[PDB]
Amino acid sequence: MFNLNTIYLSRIFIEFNFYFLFFLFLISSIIFYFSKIISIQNLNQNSVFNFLKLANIFGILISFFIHIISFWFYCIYSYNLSLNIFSDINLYNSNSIELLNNSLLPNYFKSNITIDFFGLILLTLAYIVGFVSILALDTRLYWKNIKYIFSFTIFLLIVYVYVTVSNILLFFMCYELLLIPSFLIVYFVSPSRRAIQASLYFVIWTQLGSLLVLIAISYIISITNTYEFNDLKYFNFTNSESTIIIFLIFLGFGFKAPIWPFHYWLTKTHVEAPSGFSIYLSGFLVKTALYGFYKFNTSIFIDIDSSIFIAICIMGVVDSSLKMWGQTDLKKLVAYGTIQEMNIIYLAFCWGDSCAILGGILFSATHAFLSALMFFLVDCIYRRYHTRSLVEVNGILHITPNLGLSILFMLVFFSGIPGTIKFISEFYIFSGLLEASPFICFILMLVANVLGLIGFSKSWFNATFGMPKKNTKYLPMDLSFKESYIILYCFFFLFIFSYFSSIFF
Amino acid sequence: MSSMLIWGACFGLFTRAAACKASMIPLTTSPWKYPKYMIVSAVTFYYFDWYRRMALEQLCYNEEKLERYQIRAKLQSLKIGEELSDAYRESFFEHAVQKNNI
């Protein structure tokens, strides 16, 4: 019963949501530039900053709704396309349906849009995490950094082109564009003075991996003059070229997606970055690397043993889990948790295009939401209690019961209770790893889910419980409606996404 | 879009606005410079649009000659003893006898 109307509606929605975002950004930027001689806030109720905040927030939100609709259309379209290809067995019949483009808006960068489930999951993560982070950064943007209210819109446009393109070069360029806005945010919006050095560490560490990926892309392009991302089927790389490409790709994308030993920059940046931008970084900016690694390694044929890469990922997991205990800083502890989860996700991609990719994608989504939740809780603690250190913070539950309850439920979700996409992703990865290498699976599970979990829980429980006798004149009140509903939405997603259609998982 | 003159006019308008903003002067200062910048930008970008296509056409024509150089450069680059080998003997004789038509 599938008809061409659904196909064209899917394509039109995907194409036009990008232009909706772009036109919103363009209008907002034109207003901002041409309303004032100097593009800084006027400290009065009639400033354009209020309009810009409104436009950014409710462009992201409306584009997120349209993205939900377009993602559902894509799911139907992909399912029915697979059915059309698979169903017919007659040799004379073949599915050759050709679509003509609309005459209203042009194709951005003269590229035909191609959408995949992983790309749309990444785009949904971008939308939601960007919404949370923009909601967080309101107190940070003041009177000279208001120009960074558009950072998340720029991120959304970059990610949209990144996930809706079938061109290798455009793919790589979109991946590399993410550096400038993130560096500028960390440099100009971070309150702490150590953020200045943290930004440089972030730039250099990420750029080393960017150069590695650039070398790999140069190898692919120079050898294969193609750029369509599908002509690689008709060209085979020799053993030496293939091993060089996989090594470069893995190391370069692991610089971004933190792997052992390349997580020093991540720890520094998470500790010294804005509490609202740490959410976006951990939640989304480390998963574009995973998506790019998946695309490249599934496109290239590799005839090498992945034991070395699996060992690197497992070593990162073990290192982060063991170090969890020794952190009294909640933000650094959450950063180590992010490193652990990202290393597990990266390990999920070490078997080419096997079924491990499904667990990897689900784990990427759950880690995004869980890291957003954890960093937002740390943000609330730091903002109301003027410290994010375990020695200075104690007995949160008895003065701010809602915040303590949020911490406890965050710990329960992090533990991986059944009924959560966290548990589902752990089940996928461990079920595969048990047959792949059962002893390695046992070691990984033991370390991560006992030693790292206990180290993680020690600090959070100590902060939540106790007796806050110190500085009774300065104790805060409670979570606000904004914070409470953000926490509730994170919990709601982590719980209900387990009912998403199992066809794609 | 499609008109290089209009594209250059828009570029000049935005350049003037950006110059005013950077100098911190009101955007209405020196109004006569708006049409001036638009006209200059339109004309220069129109000329460059013509020049790029002329350069591309002449480059395509030059590549024909460069192919002749590559073929003869390859034969002269052959290592000693390879010019009479079975893989290059016929081509060498073609370029040394048939093309010796002066």
Add this chain to the structure above:
Amino acid sequence: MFLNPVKDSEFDDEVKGFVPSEGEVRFVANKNKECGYYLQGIEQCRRKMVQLAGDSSSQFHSLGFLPCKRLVDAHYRCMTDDKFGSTIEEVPEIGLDSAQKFFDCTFQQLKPMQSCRRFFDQVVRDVYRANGSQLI
């Protein structure tokens, strides 16, 4: 595709699958990679001839697809390694039926080349199964 009908079947249509020999698979893959130019040429020339003489009133309407004959013969020779004749008409009786099916797919039904390559490859596979050691 790669399915054999059941000779003694209780119901009208029953099929049992078979897997071609590795030698046959290698031969077909290599020949397709080497001769893929001819198949694209057949598609492009088919469209070109239909455009040129598709109209009934056209002068060349009575010569339809004859120019494609050279491309088809070249593709057949390339796939069969210049053996078993120099023309599609010289196809052995073992592959004659599949050759007729391919011609019906391409020129009469005007079906997609995705469909008609199946029948052309079936012709090649029939020849290869018949001979075996002659092609390799």
Add this chain to the structure above:
Amino acid sequence: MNISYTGLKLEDYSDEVIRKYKFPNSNELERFLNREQTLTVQQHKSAIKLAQQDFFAVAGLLSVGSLSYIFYNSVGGKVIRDRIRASRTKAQKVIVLALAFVANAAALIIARNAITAHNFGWQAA
């Protein structure tokens, strides 16, 4: 280019060869030429027009609903909002309650319509 009708004579080719390389029916030739063997370009154009109209309706409805909800329920604290709505007239209260819901619901319904292919002619039995 040597692939042309020039120089070709039906005398040279056999009758079976001519029958094999004979043009199909005129209708088949027209369908192949126009690429309308399965679907017509007009069907594609109609589908595209409906898709664009549906997207515009959905996006406009979502924007209207979101903005109306925000502006109506973003006037102040709970007490202030309750007092403002109490002083609000009957028709004004009705619109404030109904506008956002109707816009969002219409957008969602238009989205559901596309995936639900009810207008299929095989409904029988």
Add this chain to the structure above:
Amino acid sequence: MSIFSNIWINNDLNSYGLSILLLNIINYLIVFMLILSVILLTNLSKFKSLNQFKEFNSYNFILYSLIFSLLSMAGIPPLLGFTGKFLAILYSSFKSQYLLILFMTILNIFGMYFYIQNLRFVVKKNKSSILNYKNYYVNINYSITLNIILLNFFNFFGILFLSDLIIILNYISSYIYI
């Protein structure tokens, strides 16, 4: 270079490495011109040490112009210097020079940090006063600001228009018969 029955086929354009070298030289000159124009717009005596990069901590135009020029010199992807560096690496891969690629990358990353470290010094406790005073007021030159703005636009969006510049440079180099 391929031979098929004494017919030579050349899918390689020999006059391409020279064009890439010219492109790199032009890109470096453009970025150097941008930074030097920013310096010339201000008072020259203030800048005498790497610590004095804080003196660039002036109104938004100068501050961000310096920041983006430093990033472009470093080779950050979106900016102009990245195009030259990426094309150099692409040509090295085309010529099959893996060791040259390795050494280029080592030099590139070391130089990248060399440029980046100055962003740390750019931070200043207050806003600097680096403008010359004329008629009792700071002298801001509209002409140099306009030139810096054109340079900034091209630095930001060089990737979009790089195809035309590459065509022109290849056209110039094709006259050389090498």
Add this chain to the structure above:
Amino acid sequence: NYHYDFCGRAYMGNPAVQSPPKEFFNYHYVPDNYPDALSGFRIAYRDPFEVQHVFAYENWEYQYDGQWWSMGSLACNVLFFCTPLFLYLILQVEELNSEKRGGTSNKFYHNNAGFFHFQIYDNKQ
């Protein structure tokens, strides 16, 4: 058993009471930073010992070359250092079982000919 007098090489804070530190690393903010004013903008005076502990680890550093091996326990340090090698060797030994049996092996399988998971593959007229 751990006591400060007899720990020797397992360092820990001494039990003896000490005077508060006169100088210690402290929180510092970017110039012209916008203050955080949540919940009435009430800031308490920080405890010197607590601030010192907050910033001690970040600034801690090794005094002499090779101190890392000796600090703590040499055996545990060597085991931690060799952990990646142990993991790789365990993976290879496990992969021996996979090779001899026929189960999943550590390789980049390429069942899909570059066809991404549920990707839209279409052509245009």
Add this chain to the structure above:
Amino acid sequence: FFWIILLIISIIGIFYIISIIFDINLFKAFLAYSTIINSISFILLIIAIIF
């Protein structure tokens, strides 16, 4: 003959400046070493071209 000389010069220069470029403390030195680094990179590109 030029290829080996260029390679040796490039390697020696890179390994000699890797440490020096981080020892300067002057704006003029920064500009000069930017020029020097770009010169070395272009020399490597020239080696690649003459290959």
Add this chain to the structure above:
Amino acid sequence: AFGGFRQTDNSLIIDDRRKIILNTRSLNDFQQKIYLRNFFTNYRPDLSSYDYFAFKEKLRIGELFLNEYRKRINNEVRRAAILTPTSSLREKMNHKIADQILDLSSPHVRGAHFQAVRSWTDASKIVNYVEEKQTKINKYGLQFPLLGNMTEEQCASKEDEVYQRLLKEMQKPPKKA
């Protein structure tokens, strides 16, 4: 146009088909393509791109179908456990059901393993099995709403075809022996 990467090995290549000898380091782009890079990277390289996409989808569906067999037999075991008391339960299970449970073990069905390690012959056999099931279904046209999409005219033609087929099958006499 595709290109190549300069080779460093000093090995000699003897092509008996073309009757020439080359060196690995001296190969150009086309020679590299012909001699190196000519290996296969998929189960059925003989098939076209469209045909191999169909083959890949059928293989994925076949793996899911074998997993479905395992799930169905497990559900039947649960049904047997609930319906039949523990006495005689194992006696009744030591029948077709137990043999099928063992025959649907991990080597034959990929329950939760990342990859089902199948040779190209095994993949071809699985695809052939899926195609046999598809043929059996399409004989009676059970795939209209599920596992297929068709227009109204196609549905009507298929209904008429299935009606004729059912009539002929009914009119056929019983199979002897």
